[PDB]
């Protein structure tokens, strides 16, 4: 059957819902780059192999479905945008689009995320005047 999707693969209209139904955080690798896409995802292969049962690693086209990068946070204005969507916390722990996606960079990031060090970079969550109780 079509069950048991490649947890590290490409995110598309079929697969995104599965990663979202997995219950575990989804690492959205938006990439408008078709050339270095291979390299980008190639560093992503081992770093995600390390977390192949805990994070959904999906590479998504940032040119066709790139709008989604900032439906979660990013400005969609720059080079591949690595965005970690929480399927549990609904949070979005995304990486810079203007930094560098390497093996180490992403590894360190996802590591620092899953450990609990990465925090919501923005996300409008207002602090209103509350009362005593």
UniProtKB/Swiss-Prot annotation:
It is found in: Endoplasmic reticulum lumen. Belongs to the protein disulfide isomerase family. Participates in the folding of proteins containing disulfide bonds, may be involved in glycosylation, prolyl hydroxylation and triglyceride transfer. This is Protein disulfide-isomerase. The chain holds residues 228 to 355 of 505 of the full protein.
